[PDB]
Design an enzyme around this catalytic site. Structure first.
Site, short mmCIF file in Angstrom:
data_model
loop_
_atom_site.label_atom_id
_atom_site.label_comp_id
_atom_site.label_asym_id
_atom_site.label_seq_id
_atom_site.Cartn_x
_atom_site.Cartn_y
_atom_site.Cartn_z
N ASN A 46 0.81 -1.21 0.00
CA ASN A 46 0.00 0.00 0.00
C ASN A 46 0.85 1.26 0.00
O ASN A 46 0.30 2.37 0.09
CB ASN A 46 -0.95 0.00 1.20
CG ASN A 46 -1.92 -1.16 1.17
OD1 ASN A 46 -2.21 -1.71 0.11
ND2 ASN A 46 -2.44 -1.52 2.34
N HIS A 132 -15.09 -0.54 3.81
CA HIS A 132 -14.03 -1.39 4.34
C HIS A 132 -14.38 -1.89 5.74
O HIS A 132 -15.24 -1.34 6.43
CB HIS A 132 -12.69 -0.65 4.36
CG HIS A 132 -12.70 0.59 5.20
ND1 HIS A 132 -11.56 1.08 5.80
CD2 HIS A 132 -13.69 1.45 5.52
CE1 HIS A 132 -11.85 2.18 6.47
NE2 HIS A 132 -13.14 2.43 6.32
N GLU A 174 -16.41 6.00 1.71
CA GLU A 174 -14.98 6.12 1.48
C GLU A 174 -14.70 7.05 0.31
O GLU A 174 -15.49 7.13 -0.64
CB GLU A 174 -14.34 4.75 1.21
CG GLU A 174 -14.58 3.72 2.30
CD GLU A 174 -13.82 2.44 2.07
OE1 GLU A 174 -12.66 2.51 1.61
OE2 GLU A 174 -14.37 1.35 2.33
N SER A 178 -11.54 0.53 -1.29
CA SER A 178 -10.36 -0.32 -1.22
C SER A 178 -10.44 -1.55 -2.12
O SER A 178 -9.39 -2.07 -2.51
CB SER A 178 -10.12 -0.76 0.22
OG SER A 178 -11.27 -1.38 0.76
N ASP A 203 -14.04 8.12 5.04
CA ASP A 203 -12.76 7.49 5.31
C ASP A 203 -11.94 7.52 4.02
O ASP A 203 -12.22 6.77 3.08
CB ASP A 203 -12.95 6.06 5.81
CG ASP A 203 -11.63 5.39 6.18
OD1 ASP A 203 -10.80 5.14 5.28
OD2 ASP A 203 -11.42 5.12 7.39
N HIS A 206 -7.26 5.29 1.20
CA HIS A 206 -6.55 5.01 -0.04
C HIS A 206 -6.46 6.21 -0.97
O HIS A 206 -5.98 6.07 -2.10
CB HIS A 206 -7.22 3.84 -0.76
CG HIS A 206 -7.17 2.56 0.00
ND1 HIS A 206 -6.19 1.61 -0.20
CD2 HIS A 206 -7.98 2.07 0.97
CE1 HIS A 206 -6.40 0.59 0.62
NE2 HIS A 206 -7.47 0.84 1.33
N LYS A 235 -0.79 3.99 4.25
CA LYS A 235 -0.78 3.76 2.81
C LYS A 235 0.12 4.75 2.10
O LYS A 235 1.33 4.51 1.95
CB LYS A 235 -2.21 3.84 2.24
CG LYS A 235 -3.10 2.65 2.57
CD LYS A 235 -3.74 2.78 3.94
CE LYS A 235 -4.67 1.60 4.22
NZ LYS A 235 -5.34 1.72 5.54
C1 LIG Z 1 -8.94 -0.54 4.76
C2 LIG Z 1 -8.25 -1.59 3.94
N1 LIG Z 1 -8.91 -2.18 2.89
C3 LIG Z 1 -8.27 -3.14 2.14
C4 LIG Z 1 -6.96 -3.52 2.43
C5 LIG Z 1 -6.31 -4.58 1.57
O1 LIG Z 1 -7.17 -4.86 0.49
P1 LIG Z 1 -8.03 -6.22 0.48
O2 LIG Z 1 -7.81 -6.97 1.77
O3 LIG Z 1 -9.49 -5.89 0.33
O4 LIG Z 1 -7.57 -7.07 -0.69
C6 LIG Z 1 -6.29 -2.92 3.50
C7 LIG Z 1 -5.06 -3.54 4.10
O5 LIG Z 1 -4.96 -4.76 4.28
C8 LIG Z 1 -6.95 -1.95 4.25
O6 LIG Z 1 -6.31 -1.36 5.31
#
Ligand SMILES: Cc1ncc(COP(=O)(O)O)c(C=O)c1O
Ligand SMILES: *P(=O)(O)OCC(C)(C)[C@@H](O)C(=O)NCCC(=O)NCCC(=O)NCCc1ccc(S(*)(O)O)cc1
Lengths: 381, 76
Positions: A46, A132, A174, A178, A203, A206, A235
Site C-alpha cells: 500500500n 471497508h 470512502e 479499497s 474514510d 486510499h 498507505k
Molecule cells: C482498509 C483496507 N482495505 C483493504 C486492504 C487490503 O485490500 P483487500 O484486503 O481488500 O484485498 C487494507 C489492508 O490490508 C486496508 O487497510
C-alpha cells in the site's frame, strides 16, 4: 466447550480451503519484496508513493527518537500529549482545511472511536455496502441501526435517509474504495445528506496524499468538506496511524467522550515526527512529482493490458485490479507471475463477488517504467 | 416468592435494612443510606438472582425500589 467451538470453526475454514497462512518477508513495502532469499517486484504493498523508504521520513523517525525517546509514557489525557502530537494535528488541520485534528494509533481506532462516541441507540448509520471492514465492523458493533445502501447509489441513499428515524442520521463512505479502487460521488452524497439533516463521514485511507492539490485527497478533489474526515497514514504516508478531521465543537466532544483518546497510549513522538516529515514531502514539489509519476504508471499499465482478455476496473487510483473470472486461472496466473519475479496476490470469490476472481495489483511511485513493462511482459508471455 | 418480593428482599439484604424500611417509594441513597458502591453491587445482585444483564445507562435510572421493580417487570 471452547476448544470444541474453535476446532469446529477451524475445520469449517479448512474444508473451504480458506486456511490462509502469513508469509514472512524481509522487505514488503515499496518497489521490492524480499521473501526467503529471493527478490521480487512488489505489487501488493500500500506504499502508494514509495515514502516508506524516503530518507527524510527515516531521518525524522530517528531524530525524533534522539529528542523525545521512544514511548510517550501515557495517553493524551495525562502526559502523553507531546508538542509533536499538537504540531502534527495543527498541520493536518491546516492541510485539509479543518479546524481541528485528532490523532489515533490506527484507522481502526479512529473509525471505532468516532462511531462509538457519536452514534446512540436511537441513531442510524447509512453505510455504503462496499465499505471497508474498519468502518463496517465499528458500525455493526454500534447500538445504532445499520442500514447499508447500494454501492454509490445516491437514489437508494436518499430513500434510506427519507425513512423515519427517532434520532440523528450519519452517512459514512470512502473517498477511494479499497476493493476496486473506484471513487465515490461525494458531491451528490453530501447534497442528499444535507437535505435530510444528516452528517457525512468519509474514510479517505486510499486517497489521502495520493490525489488532489498537495495530495489533500478525495474530498478536496470533489470540493466537498464532510463533517467528519478520517485519514489513515499506513498507505500513501508510508508510516502508520490515523487522524480525524472535524470542527472545534466536535473535537471537544470526541476529546470528552471517546475512550480511545482518553485511555489508549498515544503514539511515540518519533512516529509523529515521521508523520510530520511525510506530510511535508507530500505537500512539496516532490509530492507532486510522485503523484504525477504514479498516474503515468497507472496509464501505462492500463494501456498495456488492452490486448489481454482480462478486464480492468473503474479505478484511476493506485489500486488496479485485474479481473480474470475463475479461481484456478487467477491462482495459476498469480503463481506464474511470482515465479517470474512479480509478487502478485489473487483474490477469490470467497471474499468478492463470484465470477470476478481478480489479481489485487497496486502501483507505487517507487516503481519504474521497466517494472511495469516487466509486469506487462509476464502477462503477455 | 413473587417478583416484587424478590426485589425487595434483594435490596434488604444488600443494604442491611429490615424489610420494614424497604418501601416502594424508598430511595436507595436518600432513604436507605447507600454508597454508590452499594448501588452498583445492588444492580449486580439484581443481575444474579434474576440472571439478566442490566446496562449501565439503565442502572443509573434505578434509584428507588419501585424503579427496580418496574425495570424487572417492564423489560421481560
Ligand atoms: C482498509 C483496507 N482495505 C483493504 C486492504 C487490503 O485490500 P483487500 O484486503 O481488500 O484485498 C487494507 C489492508 O490490508 C486496508 O487497510
Ligand atoms: P460513586 O461514588 O458514585 O461511584 C460510581 C462508580 C461505582 C465509580 C461507577 O458508577 C462509575 O461512575 N464508574 C465510572 C465509569 C465506569 O464504568 N467505571 C467503572 C468503575 C471504575 O471506576 N473502574 C475503574 C477502571 C476505569 C476507569 C476509568 C474509566 S473511564 O472510561 O471512565 C473506566 C474504567
Amino acid at each position: 466447550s471452547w476448544q470444541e467451538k474453535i476446532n469446529a470453526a477451524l475445520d469449517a475454514r479448512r474444508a473451504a480451503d480458506a486456511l490462509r497462512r502469513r508469509y514472512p518477508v524481509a522487505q514488503g513495502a515499496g518497489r521490492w519484496l524480499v521473501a526467503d532469499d529471493r527478490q521480487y517486484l512488489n505489487f501488493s504493498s500500500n506504499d502508494y508513493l514509495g515514502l516508506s523508504h524516503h530518507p527524510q521520513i527515516i531521518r525524522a523517525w530517528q531524530q525524533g527518537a534522539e529528542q523525545f525517546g521512544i514511548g510517550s509514557g501515557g495517553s493524551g489525557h495525562v502526559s502523553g500529549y507531546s508538542v509533536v502530537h499538537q504540531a502534527l494535528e495543527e498541520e493536518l488541520a491546516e492541510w485539509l482545511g479543518y479546524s481541528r485534528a485528532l490523532l489515533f494509533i490506527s484507522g481502526f481506532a479512529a473509525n471505532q472511536a468516532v462511531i462509538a462516541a457519536m452514534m446512540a441507540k436511537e441513531d442510524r448509520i447509512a453505510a455504503d455496502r462496499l465499505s471497508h471492514a474498519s468502518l463496517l465492523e465499528a458500525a455493526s458493533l454500534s447500538p445504532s441501526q445499520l442500514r447499508r445502501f447500494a454501492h454509490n447509489d445516491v437514489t437508494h441513499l436518499a430513500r434510506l435517509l427519507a425513512s423515519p428515524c427517532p434520532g440523528q442520521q450519519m452517512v459514512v463512505t470512502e473517498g477511494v474504495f479499497s476493493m476496486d479502487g473506484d471513487s465515490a460521488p461525494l458531491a451528490e452524497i453530501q447534497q442528499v445528506t444535507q437535505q435530510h439533516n444528516g452528517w457525512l463521514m468519509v474514510d479517505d485511507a486510499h486517497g489521502t496524499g495520493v490525489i488532489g492539490e498537495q495530495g489533500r485527497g478525495s474530498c478536496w478533489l470533489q470540493k466537498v468538506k464532510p463533517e467528519l474526515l478520517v485519514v489513515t497514514f499506513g498507505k500513501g504516508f508510508g508510516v502508520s496511524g490515523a487522524a480525524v478531521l472535524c470542527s472545534s465543537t466536535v473535537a471537544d466532544y470526541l476529546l470528552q467522550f471517546a475512550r480511545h483518546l482518553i485511555y489508549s497510549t498515544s503514539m511515540p513522538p518519533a512516529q509523529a515526527q515521521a508523520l510530520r516529515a511525510s506530510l511535508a514531502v507530500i505537500r512539496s514539489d516532490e509530492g507532486d512529482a510522485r503523484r504525477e509519476k504514479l498516474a503515468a504508471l497507472i496509464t501505462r499499465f492500463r494501456a498495456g493490458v488492452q490486448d489481454l482478455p482480462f478486464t480492468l476496473a473503474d479505478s484511476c487510483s493506485a489500486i488496479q485490479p485485474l479481473i480474470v473470472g475463475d479461481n484456478s486461472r487467477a491462482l495459476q496466473l498469480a503463481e506464474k507471475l511470482r515465479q517470474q519475479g512479480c509478487w502478485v496476490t489473487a483474490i477469490r470469490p470467497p471474499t468478492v463477488p463470484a465470477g470476478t476472481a481478480r489479481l489485487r495489483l497496486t502501483l507505487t511511485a517507487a516503481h519504474e517504467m521497466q517494472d511495469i513493462d516487466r509486469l506487462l511482459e509476464v502477462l503477455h508471455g | 416468592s413473587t417478583i416484587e418480593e424478590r426485589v425487595k428482599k434483594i435490596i434488604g439484604e444488600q443494604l442491611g435494612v429490615k424489610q420494614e424500611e424497604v418501601t416502594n417509594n424508598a430511595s436507595f441513597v436518600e432513604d436507605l443510606g447507600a454508597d454508590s458502591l452499594d448501588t452498583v453491587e445492588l444492580v449486580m445482585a439484581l443481575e444474579e438472582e434474576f440472571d439478566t444483564e442490566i446496562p449501565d445507562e439503565e442502572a443509573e435510572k434505578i434509584t428507588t425500589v419501585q424503579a427496580a421493580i418496574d425495570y424487572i417487570n417492564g423489560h421481560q
